[PDB]
Amino acid sequence: HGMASMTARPLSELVERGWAAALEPVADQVAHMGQFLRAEIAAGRRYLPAGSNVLRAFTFPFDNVRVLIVGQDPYPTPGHAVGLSFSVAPDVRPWPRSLANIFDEYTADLGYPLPSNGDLTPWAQRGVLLLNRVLTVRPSNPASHRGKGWEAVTECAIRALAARAAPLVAILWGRDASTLKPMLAAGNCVAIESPHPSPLSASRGFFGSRPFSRANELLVGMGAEPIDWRLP
Ligand SMILES: O=c1cc[nH]c(=S)[nH]1
Ligand SMILES: [Cl-]
Known part of the structure; x- marks a missing residue:
């Protein structure tokens, strides 16, 4: 299921059942995004990640x-973005510098060995939502699909999460992410804020921030199961 299905089919056919319900308020918007992508392709432009990975x-x-x-936007380099924020396919080398920095902190914080590869799917399987605010990008043009309609979709998603009474920890990397705090506050969630792991900012406070262990301390304090962050 790629852009054809995103444009044409109900959410229940595209995403997990709970998410389909949570995103119902933006169902039309998701369909419009499918049409946006079809228009891009008809104009001879590509987008990333693959259609089947966008959602x-x-x-x-x-x-x-x-x-x-x-995250903000998907990786702009062809072959990096896979539809989970910061993640890459297992054979990608070197890791994008943002991900290399994330993994540096992972090992410093948790004491586990550096991951074997850049695939964050295990985190997703364990309850970590790796959500970019904007879900597509034109190759080699960072942030090029900003303002095209994805923000309403992803805001809807985050609002649905925040509105639950269930515990939520939000790891907010950089200034754009810190704009989510009004939703999070009213939902009685907790945020961990730091500079972003991009090499542009990471050494101004991302390193040493210990977001993985802190998230688990917050979760356990709230009566939730911590995340098993261990990657192979
Ligand atoms: O998915 C990604 C990858 C790098 N950076 C951001 S903000 N999101
Ligand atoms: Cl199509």
Whole structure:
């Protein structure tokens, strides 16, 4: 299911059942985004990630989400973006520098060995929502699909999470992410804020922030199951 299905089919056919219900208020908007992508392709432009990966974050159960890690836009380099924020396919090398920095902090914080590869699917399977605010990008043009309609979709998703009484920890990397705090506050969620892991900002406070262990301390304090962050 790629852009054809995104344009033409109900959410219940595209994403996990809980997510389909949570996103119902933006069903028309998702369909419009499918048409946007079809228009791009008809104009001889590409987009990233692959159509089948665009909504991938919403294919893991809504009910199990306990941590939100928000990103801005997908990786712009062809072959990096896979529909989970910051993740790459297992054979990608070197890792994008943002992901290398995330993993540096992972090992510093948790004491586990560096991951074997850049595939964050295990986190998604364990209740971490790896959500970019904007879900597509034109190759090699960072942020090029900003303002095209994705923000309403992803805001709807985050609002649905925040509105639940269930515990939520939001890891908010950089200034754009910190704009989510009004929804999070009213939902009685907790945020961990730091500079972003991009090499542009990481050494101004991302390193040493210990977001993985802190998220788990917050979760346990709230009566939730912590995340098993261990990657192979
Ligand atoms: O998915 C990604 C990858 C890098 N950076 C951001 S903000 N999101
Ligand atoms: Cl189509």
